Amino acid sequence: ETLTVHAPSPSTNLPSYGNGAFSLSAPHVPGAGPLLVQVVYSFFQSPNMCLQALTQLEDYIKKHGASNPLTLQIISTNIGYFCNADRNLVLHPGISVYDAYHFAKPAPSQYDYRSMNMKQMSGNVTTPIVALAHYLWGNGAERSVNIANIGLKISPMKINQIKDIIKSGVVGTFPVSTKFTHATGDYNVITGAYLGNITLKTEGTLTISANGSWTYNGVVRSYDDKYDFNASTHRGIIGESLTRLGAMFSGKEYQILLPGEIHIKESGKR
């Protein structure tokens, strides 16, 4: 059935992401002249780097075959890069993905999943591949991403503050305490990929003035302790890539804790 991708390990990893034949790097913008680090840096910060890496895996698989030992090594190795990068991002929050990815320290090609895999994922753009890494090699171990790291964009207008706000037309200060489904994949292709639809609890204070202006000051944490990482829960185009890869390769579903709480200060006008 599904093919086993070897856990990244110095003993199985290729010397290089893409076996050096391809690299994760910013799109070739024709007529933009030489690719400069800023582009690439920004690219690495972007979800697109994650899409690209996965796209590259998928493309490599398309060209070479999923069961192709090199494909497997490339998947393992390339995903190791992401694991490595994500490790570095987890260890050093606030560093750019480009940095975590490229330096590195320890060499991404030396990435050893068994020894190095982390339960925590950065939530950064590397995360969906790491999440896939964990599917492949995680042996079903729970992972976590802190909810503060999953780039939640909460729109109170999409939560039961909506009711307080959206006509009701109540004025004043209202306790909010509600849960809501939150399709991270609606706006966050990274978080959507691996957390997709989450359920958040928010508790806070919705203040609405008579002019429709409202502020929601609240905490958001996950309503569910964890989320399954599997085909069904991925959302968004990166999620789809995980699904396709996850469908081809042996892995174990596992759950992703979404611990932590974010404080949100949202505002809008009715």
- Identity at 149, one-letter amino acid code: N
Shared domain for 25 and 104, answered yes or no, is: yes
Element holding 197 (H helix, E strand): strand 197-208
Shared domain for 90 and 202, answered yes or no, is: no
Neighbours of 231 (CB within 10 A): 15
CB 227 within 8 A of CB 255: yes
Shared domain for 158 and 134, answered yes or no, is: no
Structural domain span for residue 256: 141-270
β-pair partners for 143: 256
Q: Is the dihedral of CA 208, 209, 211, 213 positive or negative?
A: negative
Number of domains in the chain: 2
Shared domain for 157 and 264, answered yes or no, is: yes
Shared domain for 225 and 159, answered yes or no, is: yes
User: Rounded CA gap, 207 and 174, in Å?
Assistant: 6
- Identity at 54, one-letter amino acid code: L
Helix (H, G, I), strand (E, B) or coil at 23: coil
Shared domain for 165 and 120, answered yes or no, is: no
Shared domain for 45 and 68, answered yes or no, is: yes
Q: Which of 115, 140, 165 is the last residue of a domain?
A: 140
Resolution of the experimental model in angstroms, please?
A: 1.7
Here the tokens at position 15 are 């010397």
Helix (H, G, I), strand (E, B) or coil at 174: strand
Shared domain for 151 and 253, answered yes or no, is: yes
Here the tokens at position 148 are 């503060």
Shared domain for 216 and 90, answered yes or no, is: no
User: Rounded CA gap, 235 and 183, in Å?
Assistant: 8
Helix (H, G, I), strand (E, B) or coil at 65: coil
Shared domain for 25 and 109, answered yes or no, is: yes
Shared domain for 241 and 120, answered yes or no, is: no
Nearest to 269 by CA among 215, 217, 213: 213
**Structure solved using which method?**
X-ray
Q: Within 13 Å of residue 68, how many CA atoms lie on the same side as its CB? A: 14
CB 259 within 8 A of CB 14: no
Here the tokens at position 261 are 């709480």
What lies within 8 Å, CB to CB, of 104 at 6+ separation is 84, 85, 88
The three-point CA angle 118-107-144 to 5° equals 15
Nearest to 212 by CA among 169, 154, 267: 169
Phi, psi at 173, each rounded to 5° = -125, 120
CATH for 265: 3.30.450.400
CA gyration radius for the chain? 20
User: Rounded CA gap, 3 and 194, in Å?
Assistant: 21
CATH for 134: 1.20.1440.280
Q: Which of 140, 156, 177 is the last residue of a domain?
A: 140
Shared domain for 196 and 265, answered yes or no, is: yes
Here the tokens at position 64 are 């070479």
User: Rounded CA gap, 14 and 7, in Å?
Assistant: 12
- Any idea which residue has 């260890």 for tokens? 91
- Prior bond to 269 cis, omega within 30? no
